[PDB]
Structure 1
């Protein structure tokens, strides 16, 4: 069958529900912290300690 016949390729399955929504919530947390740092260092700033 290595020479005559053939097959078909998909090459992408994970199917892990809890892992998928962990990845989605981690990406949401990353977007939160990224925009947090962005407009944290962008605009008018008052800190918690001195010069955070």
Structure 2
């Protein structure tokens, strides 16, 4: 079969349930902290310590 016949490649299952929703929720946390850092250094800023 290694020369004559052929096959088909789908190649991406990735269906690991808890791992999937870990990916999604971790990404949501990322976008949270990203926009936080952005408007953090963007707008009027007051701190918790001095100069953070």
Query: Does TM, normalized by the shorter one, top 0.5?
Result: yes
Gaps of 5+ in 2: none
In 2: Cα distance, 1:26 partner to 1:47 partner: 26
Aligned residues: 52
- For normalisation by structure 1, the TM-score amounts to 0.94
Gaps of 5+ in 1: none
Residue 6 of structure 2 is aligned to residue 6 of structure 1? yes
What is the match of residue 22 of structure 2? 22
What is the match of residue 47 of structure 2? 47
In 2: Cα distance, 1:3 partner to 1:16 partner: 34
CA RMSD of aligned residues (A): 0.7
Misfit runs of 4+, over 3 Å: none
Spell out, residue by residue over 1:3-50, the C-alpha distance to the aligned partner (whole angstroms, 9 max, x if none): 221111111111101000000000000000000000000000110000
